[PDB]
Amino acid sequence: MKDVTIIGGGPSGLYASFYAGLRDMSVRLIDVQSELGGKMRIYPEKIIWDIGGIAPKPCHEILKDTIKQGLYFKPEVHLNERVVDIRKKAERHFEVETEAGEIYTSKAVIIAIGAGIINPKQLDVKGVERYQLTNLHYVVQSYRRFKDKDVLISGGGNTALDWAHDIAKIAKSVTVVYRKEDVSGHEAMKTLVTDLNVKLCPKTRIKYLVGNDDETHISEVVLEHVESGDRHTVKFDDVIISHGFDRCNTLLSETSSKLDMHDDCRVKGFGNTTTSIPGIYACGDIVYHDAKSHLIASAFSDGANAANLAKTYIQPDANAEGYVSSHHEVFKEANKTIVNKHLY
Amino acid sequence: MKDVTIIGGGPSGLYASFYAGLRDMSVRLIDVQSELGGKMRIYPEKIIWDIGGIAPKPCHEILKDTIKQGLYFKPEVHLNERVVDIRKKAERHFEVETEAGEIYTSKAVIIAIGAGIINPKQLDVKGVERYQLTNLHYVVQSYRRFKDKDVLISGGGNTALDWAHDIAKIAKSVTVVYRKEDVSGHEAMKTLVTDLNVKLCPKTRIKYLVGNDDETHISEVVLEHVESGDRHTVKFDDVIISHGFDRCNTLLSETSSKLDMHDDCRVKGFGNTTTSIPGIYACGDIVYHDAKSHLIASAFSDGANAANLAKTYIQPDANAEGYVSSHHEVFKEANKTIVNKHLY
Numbered sequence: 001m002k003d004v005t006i007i008g009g010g011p012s013g014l015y016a017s018f019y020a021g022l023r024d025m026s027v028r029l030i031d032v033q034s035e036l037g038g039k040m041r042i043y044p045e046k047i048i049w050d051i052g053g054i055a056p057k058p059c060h061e062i063l064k065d066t067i068k069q070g071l072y073f074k075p076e077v078h079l080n081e082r083v084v085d086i087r088k089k090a091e092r093h094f095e096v097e098t099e100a101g102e103i104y105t106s107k108a109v110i111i112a113i114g115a116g117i118i119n120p121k122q123l124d125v126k127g128v129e130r131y132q133l134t135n136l137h138y139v140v141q142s143y144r145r146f147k148d149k150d151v152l153i154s155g156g157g158n159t160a161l162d163w164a165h166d167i168a169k170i171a172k173s174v175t176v177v178y179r180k181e182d183v184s185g186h187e188a189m190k191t192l193v194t195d196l197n198v199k200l201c202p203k204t205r206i207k208y209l210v211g212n213d214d215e216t217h218i219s220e221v222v223l224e225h226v227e228s229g230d231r232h233t234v235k236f237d238d239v240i241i242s243h244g245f246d247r248c249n250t251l252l253s254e255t256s257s258k259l260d261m262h263d264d265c266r267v268k269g270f271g272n273t274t275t276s277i278p279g280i281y282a283c284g285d286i287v288y289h290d291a292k293s294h295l296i297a298s299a300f301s302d303g304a305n306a307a308n309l310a311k312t313y314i315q316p317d318a319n320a321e322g323y324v325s326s327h328h329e330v331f332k333e334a335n336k337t338i339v340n341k342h343l344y
Numbered sequence: 345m346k347d348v349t350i351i352g353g354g355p356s357g358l359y360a361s362f363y364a365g366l367r368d369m370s371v372r373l374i375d376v377q378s379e380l381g382g383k384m385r386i387y388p389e390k391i392i393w394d395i396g397g398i399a400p401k402p403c404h405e406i407l408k409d410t411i412k413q414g415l416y417f418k419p420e421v422h423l424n425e426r427v428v429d430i431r432k433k434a435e436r437h438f439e440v441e442t443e444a445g446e447i448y449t450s451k452a453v454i455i456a457i458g459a460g461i462i463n464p465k466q467l468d469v470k471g472v473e474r475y476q477l478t479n480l481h482y483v484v485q486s487y488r489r490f491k492d493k494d495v496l497i498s499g500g501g502n503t504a505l506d507w508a509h510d511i512a513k514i515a516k517s518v519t520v521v522y523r524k525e526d527v528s529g530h531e532a533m534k535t536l537v538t539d540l541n542v543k544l545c546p547k548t549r550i551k552y553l554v555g556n557d558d559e560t561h562i563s564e565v566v567l568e569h570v571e572s573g574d575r576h577t578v579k580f581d582d583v584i585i586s587h588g589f590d591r592c593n594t595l596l597s598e599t600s601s602k603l604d605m606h607d608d609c610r611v612k613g614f615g616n617t618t619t620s621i622p623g624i625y626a627c628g629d630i631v632y633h634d635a636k637s638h639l640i641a642s643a644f645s646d647g648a649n650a651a652n653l654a655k656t657y658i659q660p661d662a663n664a665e666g667y668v669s670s671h672h673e674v675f676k677e678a679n680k681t682i683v684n685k686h687l688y
């Protein structure tokens with residue numbers, strides 16, 4: 001039986017998986033998404049400054065480091081699986097169940113679901129689920145691909161307007177279709193007005209997408225004025241959508257094992273990642289305790305704590321904490337090529 | 345008046361300085377040592393795995409990143425100054441005093457002194473304080489400089505024996521002088537016996553150092569057998585000393601402002617970096633609270649918490665936490681060259 005099932009592969013669950021491995025626990029890691037990272041996947045292009053010990057660089061670069069670390073001890077990773085129940089059969093015997101009916105057993109459970117399940121708002125056009133493999137975007141990880149391109153952005157929110165300005169620096173042109181009701185960034189908009197190669201189209205929506213003959217890429221877009229109904233069709237190289245996010249977090253309200261909650265979104269942590277049920281621990285944005293910050297740094301220290309507390313739940317007389325990695329024997333073989341590279 | 349005085353420039357105090365700056369507070373940072381880093385300076389060559397988001401690399405490399413981050417907002421840094429007192433004149437008015445009689449004022453105080461003041465045990469030979477600028481070592485940051493060198497190591501502890509084996513891989517020869525009483529690493533010693541270019545010298549001490557004619561480097565060493573008194577003089581390229589550490593931590597026992605303590609070494613944190621005195625906060629290894637780990641990751645999340653709590657002490661209705669760096673306006677100008685490098 002697995003020592004611990006970790007539900008959620010954001011920064012907190014990833015680090016928890018790593019530290020659980022450091023404490024010599026077998027790990028099962030589960031996430032509903034097709035990729036790990038959680039909310040970090042929402043802002044890949046943004047420069048992160050406030051992670052301890054890390055010089056500022058794009059979030060997506062930091063995410064890749066965090067995943068590699070999280071998966072170092074080779075946990076059993078279940079992607080594309082939504083957890084819908086947590087049951088405690090007995091001490092050191094838990095059941096975690098997915099919406100597809102899979103049931104996973106463990107001696108402990110770590111809940112790391114953060115803000116829950118989050119996806120970008122899908123463009124309301126049939127049927128465009130194939131263009132998101134190519135030139136229909138819901139994130140922007142870098143701007144390089146847009147050099148000398150004609151680019152369409154849909155949305156008037158801060159994110160869309162910032163994207164528009166930055167992409168316009170190297171793109172041939174940027175067109176922004178939006179509703180004025182969505183515009184909360186007054187200064188961001190004024191900047192776009194002064195960008196010579198940005199065309200602002202208020203009261204305008206994407207109505208249809210025109211695919212190429214291979215039907216694998218967007219070739220043109222049919223735009224519609226929301227009052228006049230006037231339509232025109234314009235060629236674009238890329239289409240970027242920023243319509244907000246769909247959020248879903250039903251697990252802890254529907255679960256068999258009820259935990260004391262801080263609010264309707266957060267588990268009450270008892271001074272740390274300890275929950276109201278022994279054997280279940282909560283780390284990251286999902287938990288509230290007095291030492292929390294809404295930071296990745298806190299998600300990390302939470303993950304160490306959860307792994308430690310799970311270990312001593314499973315082994316009452318195990319060491320309260322993990323051995324420092326610097327002198328940890330589990331890394332001795334792996335350290336060899338690193339030293340050799342760095343010290344010789 | 346400075347917003348906050350941070351006592352101690354280890355990982356926790358460094359990150360606290362950074363995050364205090366993120367919260368738009370003016371910072372004074374003080375450390376007794378000639379360089380920042382605290383206990384990290386003790387293990388520069390060791391590979392660190394358990395800092396969240398950081399791929400394994402030498403501690404000294406990670407330290408340099410941590411210092412650069414810690415000093416980003418250009419705090420007022422006082423090196424080589426030992427803090428001996430903390431006084432609270434009134435709310436938002438603290439006095440921090442050094443052993444040289446300097447008195448620094450602030451609206452808040454963050455205590456980040458970790459395990460206190462630590463220095464390697466100095467070789468008991470007059471007068472060798474000048475060779476430590478050149479080839480008398482108390483740390484080993486990398487092995488490269490010892491290639492084809494004849495190297496002397498004094499000490500039988502785990503650190504000395506590990507150093508000896510690793511240096512012997514590329515050094516011409518390694519001689520280890522030690523007392524058997526100090527040997528706790530049975531297997532480390534057996535390895536050295538099989539190292540062909542390692543000479544083991546139990547019951548032997550460094551008696552004298554013979555300088556070069558410039559008197560700037562060690563040229564030869566006079567070794568003495570601790571029983572027979574037999575002496576011989578051997579040429580070495582480098583001398584490395586591992587005799588343990590001198591430790592001193594009198595501040596919180598001698599201070600004017602008495603804090604509730606966890607033990608004789610640790611301040612009691614009230615669920616977090618909050619101490620028994622409003623306006624004073626403790627972060628890192630110095631504090632005990634229920635969410636602690638003896639990790640740099642916890643030192644970091646502690647530092648964010650201390651900065652946050654100090655801010656709201658100074659400004660009762662300031663935001664409870666800092667704005668995430670990704671969207672923080674203070675970084676907008678600095679981000680430009682970074683984006684440009686990374687995103688364009």
Ligand SMILES: Cc1cc2nc3c(=O)[nH]c(=O)nc-3n(C[C@H](O)[C@H](O)[C@H](O)COP(=O)(O)OP(=O)(O)OC[C@H]3O[C@@H](n4cnc5c(N)ncnc54)[C@H](O)[C@@H]3O)c2cc1C
Pocket residue numbers: 007008009010011012013030031032033036037038039040042043047048049050051081082083084112113114115116117118251283284285286294295296297299668669670671
């Ligand atoms: C736009 C933005 C900017 C930010 N910038 C910064 C910054 O600069 N610095 C910083 O420190 N923090 C920043 N943050 C906050 C940081 O992203 C979060 O603190 C961190 O992501 C929380 O990590 P987590 O693992 O606890 O939760 P999450 O990141 O939310 O990960 C939760 C994971 O659990 C999965 N999951 C959830 N539920 C279920 C279920 N029922 N079954 C299966 N799987 C499931 C989700 O798919 C998700 O992958 C920012 C946040 C936002 C949104």
Ligand SMILES: Cc1cc2nc3c(=O)[nH]c(=O)nc-3n(C[C@H](O)[C@H](O)[C@H](O)COP(=O)(O)OP(=O)(O)OC[C@H]3O[C@@H](n4cnc5c(N)ncnc54)[C@H](O)[C@@H]3O)c2cc1C
Pocket residue numbers: 324325326327351352353354355356357374375376377380381382383384386387391392393394395425426427428456457458459460461462595627628629630638639640641643
């Ligand atoms: C050999 C070793 C291996 C380790 N390996 C790891 C690892 O792999 N991963 C990990 O996460 N952790 C590791 N640690 C632990 C980590 O080093 C500590 O958790 C961390 O250094 C604590 O940081 P700190 O800022 O709280 O305290 P410290 O590092 O102790 O820094 C305290 C600073 O305050 C200064 N100071 C103190 N007192 C006074 C005074 N009265 N006046 C002025 N200045 C003052 C000191 O000079 C010092 O610079 C290791 C520790 C040791 C010793």
